[PDB]
Design a protein around this ligand. Sequence first.
Ligand code: MG
Ligand code: ZN
Ligand code: ZN
Length: 395
Amino acid sequence: MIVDGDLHIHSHYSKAVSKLMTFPIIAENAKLKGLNLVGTGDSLNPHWEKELLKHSKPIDDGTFEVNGVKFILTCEVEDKRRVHHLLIFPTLSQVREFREKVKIYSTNIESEGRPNLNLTAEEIAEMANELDILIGPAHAFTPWTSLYKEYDSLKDAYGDAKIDFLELGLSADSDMADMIKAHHSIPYLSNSNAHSPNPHRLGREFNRFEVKDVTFEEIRKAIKGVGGRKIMLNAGLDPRLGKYHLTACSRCYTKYTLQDAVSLSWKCPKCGGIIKKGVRDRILELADTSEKPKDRPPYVRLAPLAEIIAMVLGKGIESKAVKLLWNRFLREFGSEIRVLIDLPIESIASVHEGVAKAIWAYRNNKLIIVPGGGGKYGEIRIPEEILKAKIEDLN
DNA sequence: GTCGTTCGCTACAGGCGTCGGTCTGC
DNA sequence: GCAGACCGACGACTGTAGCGAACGAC
Ligand SMILES: [Mg+2]
Ligand SMILES: [Zn+2]
Ligand SMILES: [Zn+2]
């Protein structure tokens, strides 16, 4: 069976999130969006575990289900060097053991969903491999809290320890990450690290796996690529639409080149801020080889359908008209990815014509894109001739 | 025209380093 | 005067009350 999954969210116990990020709301949004599996997130917080046990019924000992949506134990933790790390747990006993093992190295583990662990990346990876916990550098290209912002390679970060995956993130895709030779030996993950159950947030990126049943062991075998199970697709947001794609400032959000950044010593002239290095320039810095493996699954660049509808209707992202159109589209069809890539444009025209034309322009890459960086999302704009034309003469 | 209905922009929140400025002891 | 210690503020880690203001069936 083929299943879509996003394995990186945060509960309402974390910071800078929404109070609507609870199990029922997340399950409803995932079921209405077209998502089969969802990572629990913040599994080290005991209150979140209590809410999971209350608002759900278990499948086995490491996979749960609520409102027809499966859930596996995941969590993001912070490093002593301030490096985000994503962890996947086999069962709940592993969660309890890992929690009780790091209480002496933390102070907010029992309070916040995203705990601060006073441990080294090598130490965290070793403790994870000790309990068969899957570990990866989550959004490892962010110039704020990532792996490549502090360390220069995976070996320098983990040392003798090993990992199991590597989250690409918003501003990255499979190819630019595969521009590193060592990355050829590690599977990729395209998650969201989303904080809101909004359509353009929850499940903006996901991974499509081929499995037999829906449990932790099947996901583990699909990640390791054994027993017929495998990760067959990585649906991700276009790298240009990320928050930190290009090297830009953190205050006025002005894009600068790497050469000008080094010349100005990372000091914004007409703003007085600290310009942060984008993921593209960081990857070009750590460029290793121009080759990439064949077994690498494809990465279909998709844009959030909510933002497409918002830019077509000429209204905001959280307005009522765009919500109505998005809900009618999800009712008439399947999921977001279906309308974004798979569904033909003549079928999309049955619900709305302008949205169909915009999706055609996105598939044909004629959609104008201005990249983002420093904390500002990338922006999309459709030309006027694509709007004032029909569908027949379009192609 | 009318008065509920909805938009879009601004402010602010809640809990570990980095970056300047300032004090101290020499 | 100055190296080094001490201090405060600032923001990721985004989401959303909320509030004039434009809107849209009567
Ligand atoms: Mg991406
Ligand atoms: Zn994170
Ligand atoms: Zn600036």
